Amino acid sequence: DAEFRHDSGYEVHHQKLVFFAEDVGSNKGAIIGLMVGGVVIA
Amino acid sequence: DAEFRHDSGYEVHHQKLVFFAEDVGSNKGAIIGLMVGGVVIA
Amino acid sequence: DAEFRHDSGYEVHHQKLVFFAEDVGSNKGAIIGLMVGGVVIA
Amino acid sequence: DAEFRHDSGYEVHHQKLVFFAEDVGSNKGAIIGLMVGGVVIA
Amino acid sequence: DAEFRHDSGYEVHHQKLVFFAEDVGSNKGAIIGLMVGGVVIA
Amino acid sequence: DAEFRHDSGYEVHHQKLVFFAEDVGSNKGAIIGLMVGGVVIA
């Protein structure tokens, strides 16, 4: 008997690429990328 | 007996590439891309 | 009997790439990427 | 005085995505693509 | 006086994604891709 | 006076993604990718 109780709100379980989550102040250079050679933020 | 209880749905998995989620202040340079060589944000 | 009770608590994840979590002051150079050679933030 | 002497190397740069170069034996599964989820080779 | 003497050409430039170089025996599963979730080779 | 003599000895490589170099026996599972979750080779 396999009883899997998952009352969550997502379907990810491998790679989760996302910035923030709740609430931040100011995003002055928010970047999230693998092998990203080159990026300038004021 | 396979009882899978997932109160959410069936989509978005393996790779989740997306910025934000709830609500941020200001997106001054929000970028999310792998192998992205080149990007300038004021 | 396999009783898995997970009320929105995915602690065991593969790869979780995300900045912040609760709330910060100012994001002046928030970057999260593996093998990222090159990045300038004012 | 800017003297740039480049006998070769004027066509590709930044991102060089290509398989092989001189000569291999057998290509039984030669793949080169970023974010490529799904591929089966016998 | 800037004297740049570069005989050779193609070889590398920021990102060099390529398999092999001289000559191998057998390529039974040659793959080169970042963030590549999924690949089966016999 | 800047005398740069580079006949076959470059330094600006940044990212060099490539398998092998001289010559191997058998490539039964040759993979080169960052953040590659998932790969099976016989």
Swiss-Prot record, chains A, B, C, D, E, F:
Annotated site (Implicated in free radical propagation): 33
Listed result of changing residue 13 to R: Only 23% zinc-induced amyloid-beta protein 28 aggregation
Residues reported to bind Cu(2+) 2: 6, 10, 13-14
Annotated site residues (Susceptible to oxidation) in this chain: 35
Residues modified by glycosylation: 10
Region (Interaction with PSEN1), start-end ranges: 24-42
Effect of residue 21 to G: In AD1; Flemish mutation; increases the solubility of processed amyloid-beta peptides and increases the stability of peptide oligomers
UniProt site positions, description: Cleavage: 1-2, 7-8, 16-17, 19-20, 40-41
Outcome of swapping residue 35 to V: No free radical production. No hippocampal neuron toxicity
Binding site for Zn(2+) 2: 6, 10, 13-14
Localization: Cell surface
Protein task: More effective reductant than amyloid-beta protein 40. May activate mononuclear phagocytes in the brain and elicit inflammatory responses.
Record note on quaternary structure: Interacts with FPR2.
Protein name: Amyloid-beta protein 42
Organism lineage: Eukaryota, Metazoa, Chordata, Craniata, Vertebrata
